[PDB]
């Protein structure tokens, strides 16, 4: 078969070498896959992928890509998958291992010994002679050394995700906020407000902040920090930029406690720079789904509202966002895009925001440089197969030649016409359709207890739920093997996704599914949360669930 043609050869010359793989279209024999990549403007044929993950992540990657492969080439194995298999996963007969076209055994224990071990991943990538590695979420997905070492290999292995430079462009909290401010993204009042000068390596695009600028947002002494705190207004947070987890951080309610608490945080992470920031109160946590190709094009795929949290853990999330005014969320989308373009982002990513419904303002929190477990919420309302889009982007195919994206913008999916994603001109508004979310999706995190008792557990590590009473709901529970904290566990986590024509409908469908599920040997509190007046009226906040407890 033939396709409409895109010639991006000039643009290919500008791309950093780490984007280019070994099997480039120019020196490759004709084939369905090669023809597709070439005609669509891509540079490298990715026909074999190593999955540096397990559980639901590995299963989702395989199913999403194989579905795209089948729809596109009539052969769902056009792009092969190699799996990494720990003794724990092998012993549990994990589905992803059985699904993969091939697999390689790896050491057990915590993930630093396997799925998150960069050197091992690179070694296996070479041994398996793969074209690319997909990490997804968790494990080493956010480790810049992964794409860097993969590209340094003589096998020139591609990373299906953002480049190391993009991940590094957003360093500690201080450097990260300054970069955001340089991209004109509103940030929470802090000791560095106004500091927005960044340095971009004219050759690598790596974004950094010179020491003389970085220090502009740091405290020179406890007394200096107090002065900065007074200006910002109490309560504030004292934070050591090099702080780990919950160390090097202290909330200050009153001036009188500042100095003492400053030393407490400083002493936990000695020598670390310290910055002051206003304390976020009960508000909203919104996310913008970012998708970027290798040619500077960053777009948003609407967003998600994950305000309902417990101990900072997302429990209930929905897409698209509805609490914010349409134009205000569009501003969050645009700011996310500005940031993505600045750090040279590529692939899927999320920009998190703090949003106050009382005054309608929003503030940057962070950019998670990875695809998230709850991504199907966004996939459902946008119609975009995200793992397939990531794969095409990794092959060098531009945003406008990704079929699901063309469909989202109301274009003929077979056409090669350029798309103006910013709708800047009358011509663009004439040939394109502004994306509109299709329906609504509610996602709930669910937990289960399946103690390891010697008895052979139900085969597989991904237990799927096929609801008999609901038509718009799907869910799963997964055995947590080889985590960073637990190599195996009695507890099992998962998610349930429910679709509806609108917020009320998806909510209703979720409740119906949960009730059906509750007829099994957990989700009882979820049903109550979903049927509360506050949730129904959408008057919840980031502190809502914690206040109920
Ligand atoms: C682990 O694999 C599960 C994942 C299900 C995720 C929930 C489900 C859904 C969302 C909301 C409500 C109900 C169900 O989302 C979907 O089915 C949609 C969005 C989606 O993920 O389907 C997958 C792809 C075509 C693509 O990525 C995307 O389509 C654009 C296919 C491969 C389905 C795989 C499933 O296995 C059969």
UniProtKB/Swiss-Prot annotation:
Domain Biotin carboxylation intervals: 45-549
Protein name as catalogued: Acetyl-CoA carboxylase
Domain ATP-grasp: residue ranges: 203-395
Binding site for Mn(2+) 1: 352, 366
Note: Present with 20200 molecules/cell in log phase SD medium.
Catalytic site positions: 370
Subunit structure: Homodimer.
Top-level taxon: Eukaryota
Gene: ACC1
Whole-protein residues included: 14 to 566 of 2233
UniProt subcellular location: Cytoplasm; Endoplasmic reticulum membrane
Positions that bind Mn(2+) 2: 366, 368
Binding positions for ATP per the UniProt entry: 243-248
Purpose of the protein: Carries out three functions: biotin carboxyl carrier protein, biotin carboxylase and carboxyltransferase. Involved in the synthesis of very-long-chain fatty acid synthesis which is required to maintain a functional nuclear envelope. Required for acylation and vacuolar membrane association of VAC8 which is necessary to maintain a normal morphology of the vacuole.
Induction conditions: Repressed in presence of fatty acids. Repressed 3-fold by lipid precursors, inositol and choline, and also controlled by regulatory factors INO2, INO4 and OPI1.
